[PDB]
Every structure is written in structure tokens, then in C-alpha cells.
Amino acid sequence: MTARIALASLFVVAAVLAQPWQTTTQRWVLGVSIAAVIVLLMFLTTRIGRALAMVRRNRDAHRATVVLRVDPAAPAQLPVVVGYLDRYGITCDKVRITHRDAGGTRRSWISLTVDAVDNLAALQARSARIPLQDTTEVVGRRLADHLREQGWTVTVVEGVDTPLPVVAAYRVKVLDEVLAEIPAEETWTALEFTGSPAEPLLTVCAAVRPLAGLTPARGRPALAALNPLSTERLDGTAVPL
Amino acid sequence: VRLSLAPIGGAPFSLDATLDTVGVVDGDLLALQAVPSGPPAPRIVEDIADAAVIFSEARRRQWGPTHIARGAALALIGLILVGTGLSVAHRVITG
Amino acid sequence: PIVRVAVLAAGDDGGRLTEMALPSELPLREILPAVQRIVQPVRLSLAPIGGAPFSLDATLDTVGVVDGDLLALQAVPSGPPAPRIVEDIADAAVIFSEARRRQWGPTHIARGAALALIGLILVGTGLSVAHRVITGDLLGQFIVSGIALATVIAALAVRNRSAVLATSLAVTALVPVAAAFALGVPGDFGAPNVLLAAAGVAAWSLISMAGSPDDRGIAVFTATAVTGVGVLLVAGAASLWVISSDVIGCALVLLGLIVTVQAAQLSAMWAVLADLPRRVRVSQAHQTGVIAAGVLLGVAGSVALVSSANASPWAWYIVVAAAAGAALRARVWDSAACKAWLLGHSYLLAVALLVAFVIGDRYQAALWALAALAVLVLVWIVAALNPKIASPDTYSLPMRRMVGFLATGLDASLIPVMALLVGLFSL
């Protein structure tokens, strides 16, 4: 963002010194300057590079993810999952909850992912090699048994689901009327928390086959990793709920 | 609600079996907390191999107000050290 | 009133890690017997990792357990250490002195020899160059190259025999090497000589960074390499095309901030998960050095713009702006050494001006330069006493935000100013 402002300031100071704005010796460059500041002003070049990379697209092991299926899901079991962001010295990166609303039923999923660089110390203790997958399995079983403790009947899953077949990308402004609103023959909604459960942050995206306050994604990568099985941080600015 | 007895740190008792079948000896500690509507929590254990490395990160706190102190003095020391030299190297020519 | 905690018991073999949930509001002496049976002549107790054992009378509430912390299973602290007692003052000197690691041993000699050597090379080089710069006679360049070549070999000769002396001998090899090339076609300490040298260390460094079998000596190589490369171009273009009365630094401070602001990507440019710990530090070492290249560059020309007298009022703001920008660009850097480097940019530059005036016979800005250090030292102290102005948590969010537009509003807002000093658009 700073490159844009610095180059803009460059050209404009370059043009303002055109007091002899004549002979097309100092007016010509003046025209080109005032012209470029317009095209430099940052929602147009972005789709330029986007389409370029998109048409180019027409041809790790630091992150493991565990995903939980619970049938009778509800916001009554929200604190139990926002707690598991940071406890037992394992610092889950982000916790994600997804529903498919194709037909009438909302097929629920919890998505838990653990990096390896910021909790390298703990994983280094379980063995000299790094038991990432096994450890993540263990925390997942812990969530399973604590959640069944409450009463909901949960199931570990690995062939989880698909919001993009393995098609409309929208990320919302922040609040509740919408998540009660969400159409078409298929609905994929995805909630995800992160950021220090001392006070958490979250981003939300949804996919179906502008309703109230949605926004499309020109340029899809954002749908490619909308499935829970994905190990990615769900691009988008965070909100303190 | 459903309150029942439980040995500490374990799942509560089964309501229709006597304590003498679960193995209650005279002198245990039993808790009147609710009943699990689900699993009895077999408390999955994972093995540890190098438990020393867990503490060594606990002591190794972050940047914190500790690395400020080293920067504090190591700044102050150099300030004095140039302070004298400047004045007397001012004098190594004139004064 | 149960709380879910995870204890850690590792005394027998490796360790056993389970978790549980436990009834609060009790003396821990009651619940200790239970955990002793799950995970498993002394007494035991519970303690947070990084702290001291908890009393057997307090509760898991009044001792401050949050639901989900990781407790350890340590022992009750201690007893007395049972002090020895020896009456004959003679043996009171031999007995109570062993606890020193005093033995001479054939390893205090290993560190002995190498430390003697590194001194021999350094003053061996400096003598000849002093035999070469204050007077003139090339016999030094014979001796310079002689020792310079020799150390070149030795580092390559113990690469797989010492594994610590090697990397140490490499870093000192570049002092005479940079001295050697700097002596071809002398001049008056010369215009294009500084071109020959920046090739040398940038050569010698790059050969050895990849030559390092491990850590402990990587960061010093990386930083001076980019520093050699960086100065090479702005010296080369300065050798033929441009006369550049003053705008060598205008290239530098530009190049400087460019390297600092674009730092994370450059580190990545040098890039079973078992060897993750070895890869993660080297990555960090790369970043911590690369940033030093920035600061050292950032001043590198900045010490030359405001250096002489008769400078520009735009030149004075051309350096100050940079400093603050870098100083406020630290809050984005996580590690410690990363922070300190850019943080003390002003400090390093402050003394540069002082010597400049004392060696330039000014005795005017010199005193001021010394008054421009205290102001920087004074703020360091008040940053240390109370962790309040150092901690951005007791702030306001738009304040946390305003400093943002404050940051990017100035670190880049000097390229228009840059066009003024040189007058790039006065043509």
C-alpha cells in the first residue's frame, strides 16, 4: 500500500513543478503524470494481476488437521470449542465450523489445525522425530470425549465433505440476520475462530451453487480451501466479534 | 439433574451396582457430581520422552522486560565512555 | 466445581502424559493420592511448568489454576543441604575449592592456541597496511596476500575436524582478504578499489555460508555478504557513469530502507520433517543478519549526507525521517536481536556525526551530537523501569492504528524529498 502512495507522491510532485505548462516540453509529461495518478488509484490493478495469475492457474507437513462430525450441532456447544484454541500447551492455530445446508439438513463439522513452528518445543518432547499427526489425533479424541461428555454424539471423520466438488465465493461484513438468512440447491457455510481465546477473533465465508451484505471474490483460490480437510488460514481480515 | 458418587478423578459410579462390586474400600473419597450422559472418559495417555525440553522453554520467556535491561545499561555504559573521551579528546587538541 | 487439567509425570522412563478433570475447592493433599495411581522414599506434589511446587494446603482455585493448564508432578522442594564442617584451616582451602572446574586439562590449551592465532593474523595484516597507507611500499601486499591466502586454506582444511574452529577461522579470513584486493591500483586509497573489495568479501562469504555444516556463524556471513553486494553496485555505477557529488548515499539510504522494508521475503529467498529444528533457526539467523545489512546500509550513506558542512535543510530531514521510520518498523519484528538492530539505528548514527565533527574540527555540532545521544538514552531508561510505555497493551486501538498510518506515512514519504536533494526533477 506504501508503494502506491510513494509512487503517487513522486509523480504529483513531479507534475506540480510544471509552471511552464507549455511547449509540450513540460506539459506533455504533465499530462502523463496526472494521467497515471488516476490509474494508480488500488482496486483495479489488483484484478489485473488476479486474472493473470488465474489464467496461469488454468494448468508442507507443518500443518495437520482433524475434523469432527457431530449431528445435532448447536451454538450451545460453542465455548467448548473456542476453549480448545489454547490449552495443554498445544496452541491450535484456528478452529473452524462448517455446515452444508443442501436440502433441509445442516451437516456439521469442526475443523482443528495445529502448526509446528510455534509449538515446536512441545512436539519435540513426545519424540525426537515430530509426531504431528498422532498428537493431533490425541487432541481430537479429547474433544470427542469431552463433547460426548456433554451429550452430543460425535464422530471422527477423514473423508469429510466437499463445498467445492473434488460455486459462489462470498465473505461477509460484520451479523446474525445473515447467518439466519443463508438461495439455491446447495449451501456451504463455514465459521472459523482464531486468535488467542483470551479474546478470540474470527472470519466467515460461505458458498452456494449479493443477497444482503455479501461480496464476491474476483480471482477460485478462496473456494479451493473452504473444505474442512484443508490446512489453510482462511484469508480475510479478522474481527473481535 | 442427576447427582451420584464418584472416586476422585474418575467417572461417576454406576447407579444400579453396589459400591462393593466396583471396589470401594473403607476410607475412599467420593464426589457428588453429575452423571455422564455419554462416555466414561478413559483419559487417553500419550507417552513423553524428553520432559526436560518442556521446562527449558518455560524458563525461556519471550523478549519481555528482561532484554530491555541489557539494552538499558549497555546503552548507558557507552554513553559515559564516549562522554569522557569526547571531552578529553576535545582536550587532546585544545581546551 | 470440577476443572480439567493435564499433569505430567516423567521420572521413570521418558514420560507419561495424561489429562483429567479434578474437583476444585480442596487441599491438594487430598487429590494427590489419586493422580499418583493413574500416571505412576520421597514426597510429591503439583507445579506449573516453570514455577515452584504448590503448597499442599491451598486449593486449585486460590493457587490460580485456569481450566486447561499443564501442571507437572514435581517433588516437595527440599530440606537443608546439610552443610559440611572442616576445622583444619589448611584443608579448608583444598576442600571448598574443587567446585570450580579449575583443571588445566588439554582443552584449555586448544582454546589457547586458536585465540593466539587470530591475533597473529589480525596484527599481521594491519602492520603491512600501516606499512602501506601512511607510508608507501608494496612489500606489504606481498605479506598481505601471503597471510590472506594462508588463512583461506586453513578454514577449508579443518572443515570436518574441529567444526567450531573452522567457522571461526572463516570469519576472520575476510579481514586480510578485503585488505588484499583493496591494494590493486591504489590511487589515493582509490576510487575503483572499493569496487574490487566488495567483490572479494561477497565472494569469500558466499563460498562459506554454504560451507557451514551447522549454525553458529551463519548470521555474520549473511549480513556482510548482502552488505558487500549492496555496496558493490552503488560503487560500480559510481565508478563510471555518475560523478555523484553527494548522491551516493541517496542511492544507499534508498537501497537501505528498501532492504529493511523488504526483509521477510529475502530470507525466504535463501531457502521427513525431523530436521525441522535445524531448518527453523537457520531461517531465523538469515533474517536477523539481513536486517543488520539494512541498518548498516541505512547509515552507510546517511553518515555521508549530513557529514560535511554546507549541507541541505532537506538533507537533515532526509536522514531523521529514515531513522524514525525504521525505529517504528520494529514493532513488527518478533525476536529480540531482530528488534535491537533497527532500534539502535539512531544510536549508531549519533556517534558517527560526533567523530565526523571532531575529526572534521567542528566543535559545534559535536556537543549537540552528544546531547542527541542522552535524549535517546533517557528514553531507553524510562522504557525499562515501568513496562508500560514499552508494552503496547495499555494503549488505545486507534493509537495502535494511528501509529500505523504514522509508520507508512513517513518511511516512504521521502522519495519525493529524495527528488529534491539531488534535484532529480530540476532537470
Side-chain angles (χ1 to χ4, degrees), chain A residues 1-2 5-7 9-10 13-14 17 26 60-62 84 86-89 116-117 120 124 126 128-130 132 142 146 149, chain C residues 4-6 17-20 67-70 261 272-274 276-277 279-280 405 408 411-413 415-416 419-420 424-426:
Chain A
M1 345 240 244
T2 184
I5 238 177
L7 273 225
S9 46
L10 165 63
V13 112
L17 201 62
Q26 182 123 37
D60 202 308
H62 327 310
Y84 269 0
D86 237 312
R87 42 207 273 165
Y88 317 101
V117 304
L120 165 62
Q124 213 167 352
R126 272 75 172 202
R129 53 99 176 176
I130 318 299
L132 182 44
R142 290 188 180 195
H146 184 207
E149 224 5 7
Chain C
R4 297 182 65 83
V5 297
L17 167 54
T18 88
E19 83 170 32
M20 39 207 63
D67 199 17
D69 38 41
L70 170 47
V261 68
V272 59
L273 73 162
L276 181 57
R279 287 211 277 95
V280 58
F405 193 88
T408 173
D411 66 85
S413 315
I415 172 68
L420 319 180
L424 185 66
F425 69 118
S426 160

Side-chain angles (χ1 to χ4, degrees), chain B residues 57-71:
Chain B
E57 178 84 345
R59 316 285 152 184
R60 195 169 60 98
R61 77 281 174 193
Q62 195 38 264
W63 160 261
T66 321
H67 298 259
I68 296 282
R70 299 176 66 173

Side-chain angles (χ1 to χ4, degrees), chain B residues 33 45-48 59 75 86 93, chain C residues 1 14-15 17 50-51 347 363 370:
Chain B
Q33 319 278 34
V45 49
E46 66 176 358
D47 175 280
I48 279 185
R59 316 285 152 184
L86 157 70
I93 51 155
Chain C
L17 167 54
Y347 200 68
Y363 338 117
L370 192 168

Side-chain angles (χ1 to χ4, degrees), chain B:
Chain B
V1 304
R2 191 66 274 156
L3 283 295
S4 313
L5 309 157
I8 300 283
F13 272 123
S14 191
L15 187 48
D16 302 342
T18 79
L19 308 178
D20 213 303
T21 320
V22 177
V24 156
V25 287
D26 197 357
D28 273 18
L29 280 304
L30 306 175
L32 279 192
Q33 319 278 34
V35 171
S37 298
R43 55 208 50 213
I44 185 62
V45 49
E46 66 176 358
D47 175 280
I48 279 185
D50 198 352
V53 73
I54 292 192
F55 310 95
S56 44
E57 178 84 345
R59 316 285 152 184
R60 195 169 60 98
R61 77 281 174 193
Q62 195 38 264
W63 160 261
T66 321
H67 298 259
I68 296 282
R70 299 176 66 173
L74 279 182
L76 172 55
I77 304 142
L79 170 65
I80 285 154
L81 194 63
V82 63
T84 283
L86 157 70
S87 174
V88 185
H90 173 276
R91 186 73 167 171
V92 83
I93 51 155
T94 180

Side-chain angles (χ1 to χ4, degrees), chain C residues 129-152:
Chain C
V129 170
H131 199 76
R132 199 49 208 82
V133 77
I134 301 314
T135 194
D137 186 4
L138 271 302
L139 179 64
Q141 182 160 358
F142 185 80
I143 302 288
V144 169
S145 42
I147 294 284
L149 172 72
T151 183
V152 162

Side-chain angles (χ1 to χ4, degrees), chain A residues 93-125:
Chain A
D93 305 312
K94 52 95 166 181
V95 300
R96 176 200 277 164
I97 310 166
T98 54
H99 304 305
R100 186 218 286 262
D101 206 2
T105 174
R106 306 175 65 183
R107 301 176 45 71
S108 87
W109 321 94
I110 308 301
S111 311
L112 309 178
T113 104
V114 161
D115 204 0
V117 304
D118 359 83
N119 57 2
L120 165 62
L123 312 174
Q124 213 167 352

Side-chain angles (χ1 to χ4, degrees), chain C residues 99-165:
Chain C
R100 161 68 187 70
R101 182 33 180 138
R102 80 197 186 289
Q103 307 73 2
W104 179 238
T107 168
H108 286 253
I109 324 162
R111 186 183 309 127
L115 266 180
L117 181 42
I118 302 313
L120 170 72
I121 280 171
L122 259 297
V123 73
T125 288
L127 164 69
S128 80
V129 170
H131 199 76
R132 199 49 208 82
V133 77
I134 301 314
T135 194
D137 186 4
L138 271 302
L139 179 64
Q141 182 160 358
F142 185 80
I143 302 288
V144 169
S145 42
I147 294 284
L149 172 72
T151 183
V152 162
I153 308 306
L156 310 167
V158 188
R159 176 156 315 277
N160 55 66
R161 285 287 302 258
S162 89
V164 58
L165 159 67

